[PDB]
Paper text:
Folding and insertion of OMPs into the outer membrane is mediated in Escherichia coli by the β-barrel assembly machinery (BAM) complex, via a mechanism that remains unresolved. The E. coli BAM complex has a molecular mass of ∼203 kDa and consists of five proteins (BamA–E). Its core component is the Omp85-family member BamA, which contains a carboxy-terminal, membrane-embedded, 16-stranded β-barrel domain and five polypeptide transport-associated (POTRA) domains at its amino terminus, which project into the periplasm. The other four subunits (BamB–E) are accessory lipoproteins ranging from 12 to 41 kDa in mass and attached to the membrane by N-terminal lipid anchors.
Numbering used by the authors:
A (entry chain C): 25 to 189
B (entry chain E): 24 to 110
C (entry chain D): 26 to 243
D (entry chain A): 24 to 806
E (entry chain B): 22 to 392
């Protein structure tokens, strides 16, 4: 709303929790054993994971829309889940072909023998984030019978030309 | 300094002479606890000693005091009733 | 005020308001969306969007509520790491956010109510999600927060030190120790305890502390 | 058959798989004709399917389901003062809300519930109607009509079984209202069984405290009169008879304080039994023991009633418990301010015996603090020990500080403005701040004022005030009374008692006057000063540097530190000059703030406010005319204009000011208005005696939630300012302000609004008692 | 403000005013309030040209039914107590038997006055005030109180013979549950929806039968003014449930012969095989006694605040709280005469007895009506 330039992917205020120094653990002398483990400070120590502070996205996590009826909407890993319960095991494949060209996607390879395809990078973005992107996807329709699973696999996230790893 | 008014400072956490007579060395922490419960202080890393000290300042006229501690051994058995008074 | 459109369209409209950055408007659509289509497949996402937008719009009580719902609506879910993180983040910010920091005026002397809540939140995150994408940051938060918590309690001990409540001083220092043996405030609290012991004619006990200080004399 | 597959029609709110699971006949599961029926009703049992038509193509099932969801909205119309949500809560209680299915066959039940709601409300003549509007897919808008016909009314309480008291006198003590005179509107005649319940107990206590140990209530039947409104009441009681308290048989763990308990139970044998006295005494003992450390002192009286003579031996069982529960304390809601500020206000301390009085005392102090809105706590016993209770002082913090200013006339004149803002516990640091000023083309003024109420532990209220009044009456620079006034004012507040505090410090005043006005008050002062100013000229200057001693004392046993309702404060403050000044004089004043709640719940409160003062010389000297007493416009006085109350300056036959715009600013001057032209310039007096009669009233429009920060008040205000050195023989053609009989008077209403910048009091007053030279204004607006 | 906020339902008014038998009043010797707006069972009685009239707060009148001449007057206002002249505040209707006039008060008192002058033959306190007019017969004063008690007193002094707990509802659901007699048994409804027969001779329950629903969880018509006083006809009892549901049952078994459990009928009389009644909606209807079969109905006075129906001079008579009197053709079924005798308003029972028609308004109280 009203802010001093930006604030789409960051935390408010400073990064005090990163800025602050490590703690000077106490080393009591022999025989002086105090019950200093009586608190609730169950803090595990490791290098996991992600970025920190502003570098750490506080983005509302991904989950796609019900683009198709009955879609199992949920992005996980690199895949946007959109599984569909129809009536025959060859309905999503032609639906996908229609959708691909409804979206005007450029296709690298077409598995017409099966029901899958490899696409190139298509540019997309949203001003609710401080960056712009491109996505390369592997589409896989999985004829389970009346239901066909729909795998929308982000083969590569490219930040408006910068292949994100 | 040369001041008459002073908010009194109190405290608590102490045993009366009656409470002292209620117990004796050899009694366990629980035997004591059965009517004297617990102090609001022990020995952070030593033993089972209980600290029942009374303090209270009377408007710039020094401070009153009865420091009583009860040293119990590792089995919770009272070994020493240190009924220290003021100073 | 929100027109009824397809839930995908309403959602997209909310995204457009998020594009604007007008969190208030985005939220308006998101809420309307779950109020028009509460059964939408991505109503969970709407709640995530709301958690985000509420944070962005300083509506931390509502971010908190959205999280509570997410938890109850999705006891197990791939995006909980976020939700848990945000719970802590929300509560953290809820605890400390006054503009007084601008003027160099500290808040560690305010009771870390939501900060303690956040402590728990983040500790759940880092334990339950040992290496999630939010865990490093959360871990750091747990460390610093502990120090803040200590500063508060330390300040409390200082109050009693000033007051002359030597018993309280010792117990407050001891409380810090029992919680954790590590903050600088803990190192500083340590001699406050000793002082109190001398003030209580517990010199021997004071000496015990002095020995600890000697071991920690660096 | 065996279902081949299922044509999942009629879903929307229900998922394909959810329907599959709901069905007895899921794909691959054998299908009997009875199972088709079972499936039909199983799908109906989901509560989301308006219709279910399970069929099949040979053996391939298909089900022509019609969905009955989804409640998209709910509309409330005609509900009047009833909160739609309340109505919705009952709707929700029946499982109906936005996102739920709409089972239309339950509408009648819903409607019943809504009419039952009205029934419980004290209404009943009301009827409701659900209206269903369809939305895309299946969705509905549940519009609800609330035909509120008319509420019930209390008509007449009939008490039978009584023998000694008037039915009506008992009614006069009841919450219920079976008659409300226009000349005695003490409520509305509306029936509530909750009021009844209270009244039954009121009744019980009515007799209880009159000796009726055997008083009881048999039963009651409220009259339901044919018209949904005639509320009459049948009360069946047993008076019992006035038994006399013949003694008390207190025992149990009396903690060795049985003597104090005996004192608490000093009753009279043959005294009419008084169960509220008993109640009181039980609690008195609890409090007694609370003082003695006993957080949990069970007390249980037992009226050993003797029906053979109608007396009673109040046995009392007591279990005092432990003495030392005070472990540690906490505070809550202190997130806007340093916790130590609150800690220092607790008399109760940690590692201690319970001093329940100290707890309350600390809360009183916190109540008087003024940086909080509400005071509360939480004596939470720590599990596992009778020596461990933690007390969390959960309070509601208050926004403090306040910016305000006056302005105009400017734009086409020399740019000007006023400054002035309080922080009052600046950012929770504990510092009281009130800094102000004003830059004008007449004068420029600065003032600093900051106090550290607890510079050290004891309450060293380190208060410093600085000021700089570049006042020149700048219509040129001088000639119209230049008077720069600047200096120092630093004092210390002292801890004297729980309610007592002193003030002491020093003042520094350096004034620089030049070409002062031809007037009696001014000149008279200067003649007291040994100066010899001209009655016809403004060619006199005057520089002075005074050193003074400031002091005072306050009493403070009054509720909230920002809007109290019960107690009183006294504010003694005065000064006396010291050697080194250019004039030996004094000025001593005192303010009083008394609150006497009219209503026992403090809804209405008597406010007494007065101000007193007097200043004069210490021997051949005199308090300066610019230090006089002034009243009107603001401060405490309203109805009359700003500082227009008090003695008025009399000008002398002026001829040369060293600047006098051709006819303008006449001060008894050359250009018109010649001779001793007395002015309307309320120069002020050397004596003060004012009073204010204000009465707190409640606002029936603002939700209590924050109406309790708002204060309206009725008032009758009056007072006087006068000059005891007003030599009426020299003022022979003028008023006589040596006489205290100069009391001005106004009356009306005060309107305190607690804005983001604190309480802003606006008011209306009718300045009735007006004197010559007074100015007035019925509508005044203050901070 | 609030006058416009209240959604008050309008009543049907009064179609076809008649005067086929041009109605009038024999006399309007009112006496004064009376009932006022205080809902009460107090209602007039009439016999041997003695108008047994009384106001609620005080006076007891004997008026001469040749004109409305005060034969005598006394008052049940108790000269002292907790205030001054502790007003009569009568709770039950006027019952007359032998040389006594019987009235129950709101002070739980039962008075018996000398019909020739008004002398308190006796007065005795009972267990609470009455919702019903006392039924005096066979040495007993049969009483139904607001606190659900059945009491029998000695009609000669008031000695309590017994007190029995009856069909008590959630609160004081207004309605007259007066015990009627038949073959030694007392028959009475109940304000909670049951009905019973109780040995009149000793207060010994014969049988009790639940008929319908009452207020509390099944909250009914708090507006409705029914009639839990049964009309025993031969071996079948015809009565309304507290909620106005009509039922016929075996006098000696409680078995339901038939019922119209379907709406809160307010008032009713059983004219052989024509049960005349005033519906919940104050609609006039005649029903058979072999099942409530509609013979005829009239909604002209729908929602008008009608009294009970009585028969007089061959017409169906009913008045209202508006002050209007109506005469309906006993068969089908419409106006024959109509007379607004006042505006004071009637609620008490019309007394088509002693060859007369005595009615009592709120303040205009006593009127003798004719045509």
């Amino acid at each position: 709303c009203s802010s001093d330039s930006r604030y789409k992917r960051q935390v408010s205020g400073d990064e005090a929790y990163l800025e602050a120094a490590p703690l000077a653990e106490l080393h009591a002398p022999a025989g002086m054993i105090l019950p200093v483990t009586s608190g609730d400070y169950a803090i595990p120590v490791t290098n996991g994971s992600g970025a920190v502070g502003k570098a750490l996205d506080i983005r509302p996590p991904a989950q796609p829309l019900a683009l198709v009826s009955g879609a199992r909407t949920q992005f996980t890993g690199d895949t946007a889940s959109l599984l569909v319960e129809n009536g025959r095991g060859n309905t999503l494949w032609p639906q996908v072909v229609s959708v691909l060209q409804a979206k005007n996607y450029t296709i690298t390879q077409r598995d017409d023998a099966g029901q899958t395809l490899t696409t190139d990078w298509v540019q997309w973005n949203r001003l609710d984030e401080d960056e712009q992107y491109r996505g390369r996807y592997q589409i896989s329709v999985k004829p389970q019978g009346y239901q066909q699973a729909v795998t929308v696999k982000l083969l590569n996230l490219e930040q408006a030309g910068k292949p994100v790893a | 300094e040369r001041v008459v008014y002073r908010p009194d400072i109190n405290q608590g956490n102490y045993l009366t002479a009656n409470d002292v007579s209620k117990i004796r060395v050899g009694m366990t922490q629980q035997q004591v606890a059965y009517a004297l419960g617990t102090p609001l202080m022990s020995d952070p890393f030593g033993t089972n000693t209980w600290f029942y000290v009374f303090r209270q300042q009377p408007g710039h006229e020094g401070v009153t005091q009865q420091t009583l501690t009860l040293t119990f051994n590792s089995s919770g058995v009272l070994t020493n009733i240190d009924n220290k008074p003021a100073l | 005020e929100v027109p009824d459109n397809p839930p995908n369209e309403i959602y997209a409209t909310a995204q457009q308001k998020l594009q604007d950055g007008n969190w208030r408007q985005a939220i308006t659509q998101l809420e309307a969306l779950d109020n028009r289509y509460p059964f939408g497949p991505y109503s969970q996402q709407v709640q995530l969007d709301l958690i985000y937008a509420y944070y962005k719009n300083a509506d931390l009580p509502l971010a908190q509520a959205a999280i509570d719902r997410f938890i109850r609506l999705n006891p197990t879910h791939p995006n909980i790491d976020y939700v848990m993180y945000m719970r802590g983040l929300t509560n953290m910010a809820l605890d400390d956010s006054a503009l007084q920091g601008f003027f160099g005026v500290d808040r560690s002397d305010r009771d870390p109510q939501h900060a303690r809540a956040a402590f728990s939140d983040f500790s759940k995150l880092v334990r339950g999600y040992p290496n999630s994408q939010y865990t490093t940051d959360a871990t750091k938060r747990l460390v610093f927060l502990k120090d803040r918590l200590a500063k508060y309690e330390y300040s409390v001990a200082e109050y009693y030190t000033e007051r002359g409540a030597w018993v309280a001083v010792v117990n407050r220092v001891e409380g810090m120790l029992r919680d954790y043996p590590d903050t600088q405030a803990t190192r500083d609290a340590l001699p406050l305890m000793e002082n109190a012991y001398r003030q209580m004619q517990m010199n021997a006990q004071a000496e015990k502390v002095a020995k600890i200080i000697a071991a920690n004399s660096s | 058959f065996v279902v081949k597959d299922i044509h999942f029609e009629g879903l929307q709110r229900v998922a394909v798989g959810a329907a599959l699971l709901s069905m007895p006949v899921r794909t691959g599961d054998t299908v009997n004709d009875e199972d088709i029926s079972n499936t039909i009703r199983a799908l109906f049992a989901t509560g989301n399917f308006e219709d279910v038509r399970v069929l099949r193509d040979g053996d391939t099932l298909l089900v022509q389901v019609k969905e009955r969801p989804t409640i998209a909205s709910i509309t409330f119309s005609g509900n009047k003062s009833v909160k739609d949500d309340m109505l919705k809560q009952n709707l929700e209680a029946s499982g109906v809300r936005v996102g739920e299915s709409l089972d239309r066959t339950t509408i009648a039940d819903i409607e019943k519930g809504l009419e039952d709601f009205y029934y419980s409300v004290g209404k009943y003549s009301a009827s409701v109607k659900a209206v269903v509007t369809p939305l895309p897919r299946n969705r509905v808008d549940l519009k609800l009509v609330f035909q509120e016909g008319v509420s019930a009314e209390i008509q007449q309480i009939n008490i039978v079984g009584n023998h000694a008291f008037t039915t009506d006198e008992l009614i006069s003590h009841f919450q219920l209202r079976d008659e409300v005179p226009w000349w005695n509107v003490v409520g509305d005649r509306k029936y509530q069984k909750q009021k009844l319940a209270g009244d039954l107990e009121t009744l019980r206590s009515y007799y209880l405290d009159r000796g009726y140990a055997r008083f009881n209530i048999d039963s009651t039947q409220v009259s339901l009169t044919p018209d949904k409104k005639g509320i009459y009441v049948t009360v069946n009681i047993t008076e019992g008879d006035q038994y006399k308290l013949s003694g008390v048989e207190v025992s149990g763990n009396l903690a060795g304080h049985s003597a104090e308990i005996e004192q608490l139970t000093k009753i009279e044998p043959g005294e009419l039994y008084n169960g509220t006295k008993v109640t009181k005494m039980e609690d008195d003992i609890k409090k007694l023991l609370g003082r003695y450390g006993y957080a949990y002192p069970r007390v249980q009286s037992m009226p050993e009633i003797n029906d053979a003579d109608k007396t009673v031996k109040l046995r009392v069982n007591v279990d005092a418990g432990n003495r030392f529960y005070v472990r540690k304390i906490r505070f809550e809601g202190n997130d806007t301010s340093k916790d130590a500020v609150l800690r220092r206000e607790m008399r109760q301390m940690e590692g201690a015996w319970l001093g329940s009085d100290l707890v309350d005392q600390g809360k009183e102090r916190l109540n008087r603090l003024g940086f909080f809105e509400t005071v509360d706590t939480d004596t939470q016993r720590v599990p596992g020990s009778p020596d461990q209770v933690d007390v969390v002082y959960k309070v509601k913090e208050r926004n403090t500080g306040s910016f305000n200013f006056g302005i105009g006339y400017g734009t086409e004149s020399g740019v000007s403005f006023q400054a002035g803002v309080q922080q009052d516990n600046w950012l929770g640091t504990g510092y009281a701040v009130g800094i102000n000023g004003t830059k004008n083309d007449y004068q420029t003024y600065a003032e600093l004022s900051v106090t550290n109420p607890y510079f050290t532990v004891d309450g060293v209220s380190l208060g410093g005030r600085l000021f700089y009044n570049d006042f020149q009456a700048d219509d040129a620079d001088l000639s119209d009374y230049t008077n720069k006034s600047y200096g120092t004012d630093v004092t210390l507040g002292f801890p004297i008692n729980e309610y007592n505090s002193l003030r002491a410090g020093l003042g520094y005043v350096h004034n620089s006057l030049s070409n002062m006005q031809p007037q009696v008050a001014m000149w008279r002062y200067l003649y007291s000063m040994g100066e010899h100013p001209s009655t016809s000229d403004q060619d006199n200057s005057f520089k002075t540097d005074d050193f003074t001693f400031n002091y005072g004392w306050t009493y403070n046993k009054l509720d909230r530190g920002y809007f109290p309702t019960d107690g009183s404060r006294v504010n003694l403050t005065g000064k006396v000059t010291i050697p080194g000044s250019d004039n030996e004089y004094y000025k001593v004043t005192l303010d009083t703030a008394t609150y006497v709640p009219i209503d026992d719940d403090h809804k209405w409160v008597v406010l007494g406010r007065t101000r007193w003062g007097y200043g004069d010389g210490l021997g051949g000297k005199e308090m300066p005319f610019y230090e006089n007493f002034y009243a009107g416009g603001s401060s405490t006085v309203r109805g009359f204009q700003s500082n227009t109350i008090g003695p008025k300056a009399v000008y002398f036959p002026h001829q040369a000011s060293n600047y006098d715009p051709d006819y303008d600013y006449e001060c008894a001057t050359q250009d018109g208005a010649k001779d001793l032209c007395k002015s309307d310039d309320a120069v002020g007096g050397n004596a003060m005696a004012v009073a204010s009669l204000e009465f707190i009233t409640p606002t029936p429009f603002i939700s209590d939630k924050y109406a309790n920060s708002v204060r309206t008040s009725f008032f009758w205000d009056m007072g006087t300012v006068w000059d005891t050195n007003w030599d009426s023989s020299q003022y022979s053609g003028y008023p006589d302000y040596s006489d205290p009989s100069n009391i001005r008077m106004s009356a009306g209403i005060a309107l305190q609004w607690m804005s983001p910048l604190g309480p802003l009091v606006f008011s209306y007053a009718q300045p009735f008692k007006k004197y010559d030279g007074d100015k007035a204004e019925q509508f005044q607006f203050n901070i | 403000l609030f006058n416009s906020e209240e959604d008050v339902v309008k009543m049907s008014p009064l179609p076809t005013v008649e005067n086929q038998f041009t109605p009038t009043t024999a006399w309007s010797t009112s006496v004064g309030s009376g009932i006022g707006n205080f809902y009460s069972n107090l209602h007039p009685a009439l016999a041997d040209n003695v108008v047994y009239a009384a106001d609620r707060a005080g006076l007891v009148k004997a008026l001469n039914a040749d004109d409305g001449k005060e034969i005598w007057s006394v008052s049940l206002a108790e000269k002292d107590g907790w205030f001054s002249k502790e007003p009569a505040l009568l709770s039950g209707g006027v019952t007359v038997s032998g040389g006594h006039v019987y009235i129950g008060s709101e002070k739980a008192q039962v008075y018996a006055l000398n019909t020739s002058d008004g002398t308190v033959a006796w007065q005795t306190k009972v267990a609470g005030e009455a919702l019903s007019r006392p039924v005096v017969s066979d040495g007993l004063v049969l009483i139904h109180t607001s606190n659900g008690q059945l009491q029998a007193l000695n009609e000669a002094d008031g000695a309590v013979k017994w007190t029995v707990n009856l069909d008590m509802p959630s609160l004081s659901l207004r309605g007259e549950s007066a015990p009627t007699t038949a073959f030694g048994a007392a028959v009475v409804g109940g304000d909670n929806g049951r009905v019973s027969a109780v040995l009149m001779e000793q207060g010994q329950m014969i049988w009790q039968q639940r008929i319908s629903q009452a207020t509390g969880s099944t909250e009914i018509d708090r507006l409705s003014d029914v009639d839990t006083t049964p009309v025993v006809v031969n071996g079948v009892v015809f009565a309304l449930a507290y909620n106005g549901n009509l039922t016929a049952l075996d006098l000696r078994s409680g078995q339901i012969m038939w019922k119209r459990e379907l709406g809160s009928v307010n008032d009713f009389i059983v004219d052989g095989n024509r049960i005349y009644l005033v519906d919940q909606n104050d609609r006039v209807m005649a029903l058979t006694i072999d099942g409530g079969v509609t013979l005829w109905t009239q909604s002209d006075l729908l929602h008008r605040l009608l009294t009970s129906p009585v028969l007089y001079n061959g017409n169906l008579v009913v008045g209202d709280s508006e002050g209007y009197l109506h005469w309906i053709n006993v068969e089908d079924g419409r106006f024959v005469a109509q007379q607004k005798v006042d505006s004071s308003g009637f609620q008490t029972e019309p007394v088509a007895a002693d060859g007369k028609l005595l009615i009592q308004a709120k303040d205009g109280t006593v009127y003798s009506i004719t045509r």
